[PDB]
C-alpha cells in the first residue's frame, strides 16, 4: 500500500524514467522516426514494469495496456522534452525537427501541428516535472477500457496515480477551486494526447523500407509474456 503513497510513487516514477535514446543514423525521416520508436518501445516496457503494481496485474492486462498506449506514451514523452522550444519537436538527442520539415512526408505536417499545439498547452499550464511523471503513468493505465469492464487491481492502481497527481497539485499551494481547475485542465489534455495518438497510428498503418514497429512491439510483448 505504502509503495503507492503520493511521495514515494513520484520518486519511484522518477527513477523509472527511460534513458536517452540515440537513433544513430549511419522515407528517411520516416525511417529515422520508425527506428527511434522501435528503440523507445524497448525502454517503455522496462519503464512500465517499474510502475508499482504494474507487474502484479494479469499478463493479459499488461499486454493490453502496453499495446494500446505505446504511441500515446511516446508522444507524451516527445511533448515533454519539446515543451520549452516552440516550433520544434525534440524526438531524440540527434533528431530535432521543426514544423516545416514535416512538409516533406505527406500527412505528417498535420500530426506535427497537433503535437506542437498540445505541447504549447502544457507549456502554458506550466506542467511540472512531477505532474508530467504522474500523467504519463496515467496514460498507460487508462489506455484500454476493456481490462476494466485483476480489474480490481487496475482500478486501484489508476486511483493511486490519480491521488498522487492530486497530491502534487495540492502542495502547489493554490486554492481549492484552482486545484480542481488544474486537475480538470490536465486531464482534458489527455483527450488531445489520445487524439494525436490515433492520427499517428492511422498515418503509420497507411504507410508503404522503414522499420516495422507494431510487429516488433508484438515480438517484445511475446517475450515480455515468456
Ligand X SMILES: COCc1cc(O)cc2c1O[C@@H](c1ccc(O)cc1)[C@H]1CCC[C@@H]21
C-beta of 1: minimal distance to ligand X in Å?
34
The interface partner of residue 60, options being ligand X, a copy of itself, none and the CB cut-off 5 to 8 Å by kind, is none
C-beta of 185: minimal distance to ligand X in Å?
23
Q: Which of residues 47-76 bind ligand X (CB under 6 A)?
A: 74-75
The interface partner of residue 33, options being a copy of itself, ligand X, none and the CB cut-off 5 to 8 Å by kind, is ligand X
The answer to whether 204 contacts ligand X (rule: CB under 6 A) is yes
Question: Using CA atoms, how far apart are residues 109 and 102, in angstroms rounded to an integer?
Answer: 5
Residues that bind a copy of itself (CB under 8 A): 114, 117-118, 120-121, 124, 138, 142, 145-146, 148-149, 158-159, 162-163, 165-166, 177, 180-181, 183-185, 187-188, 190-195, 198-199, 202
The answer to whether 78 contacts ligand X (rule: CB under 6 A) is yes
**At which residue does the C-alpha cell 525521416 appear?**
29
* Binding residues for ligand X, total number by CB under 6 A: 18
Sign (positive/negative) of CA torsion 175, 177, 181, 187?
positive
Among residues 10, 23, 37, 57, which is the contact residue for ligand X, using CB under 6 A?
Answer: 37
Long-range pairs, 43-46, Cβ under 8 A, ≥24: 43/18, 43/19, 44/18, 44/70, 44/73, 44/74, 45/220, 45/221, 45/224, 46/18
Question: Using CA atoms, how far apart are residues 47 and 51, in angstroms rounded to an integer?
Answer: 7
The answer to whether 34 contacts ligand X (rule: CB under 6 A) is yes
Residue among 42, 73, 59, 224 at smallest CA distance from 138: 73
Question: Using CA atoms, how far apart are residues 166 and 183, in angstroms rounded to an integer?
Answer: 7
The neighbouring-strand residues paired with 98 are: 88
Judged by the rule CB under 6 A, the positions of this chain that interact with ligand X are 30, 33-34, 36-37, 40, 74-75, 77-78, 91, 108, 111, 200, 203-204, 207, 213
Amino acid at each position: 500500500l505504502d509503495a503507492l503513497s503520493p511521495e514515494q510513487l513520484v520518486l519511484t516514477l522518477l527513477e523509472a524514467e527511460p534513458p536517452h535514446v540515440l537513433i544513430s543514423r549511419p522515407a528517411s525521416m520516416m525511417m529515422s522516426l520508425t527506428k527511434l520508436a522501435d528503440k523507445e518501445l524497448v525502454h517503455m516496457i522496462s519503464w512500465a514494469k517499474k510502475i508499482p503494481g504494474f507487474v502484479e496485474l494479469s499478463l493479459f492486462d499488461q499486454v493490453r495496456l502496453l499495446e494500446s498506449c505505446w504511441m500515446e506514451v511516446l508522444m507524451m514523452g516527445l511533448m515533454w522534452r519539446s515543451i520549452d522550444h516552440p516550433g520544434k519537436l525534440i524526438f531524440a538527442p540527434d533528431l530535432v525537427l521543426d514544423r516545416d520539415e514535416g512538409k516533406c512526408v505527406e500527412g505528417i505536417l498535420e500530426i506535427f501541428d497537433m503535437l506542437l499545439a498540445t505541447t504549447s498547452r502544457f507549456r502554458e499550464l506550466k506542467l511540472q516535472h512531477k505532474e508530467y511523471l504522474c500523467v504519463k503513468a496515467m496514460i498507460l493505465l487508462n489506455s484500454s477500457m476493456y481490462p476494466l469492464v485483476s480489474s480490481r487491481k487496475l482500478a486501484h492502481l489508476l486511483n493511486a496515480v490519480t491521488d498522487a497527481l492530486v497530491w502534487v497539485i495540492a502542495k502547489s499551494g493554490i486554492s481549492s477551486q484552482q486545484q480542481s481547475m488544474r486537475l480538470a485542465n490536465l486531464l482534458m489534455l489527455l483527450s488531445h494526447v489520445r487524439h494525436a495518438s490515433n492520427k499517428g497510428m492511422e498515418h503509420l498503418l497507411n504507410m508503404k523500407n522503414v522499420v516495422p514497429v507494431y510487429d516488433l512491439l508484438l515480438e517484445m510483448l511475446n517475450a515480455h509474456v515468456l
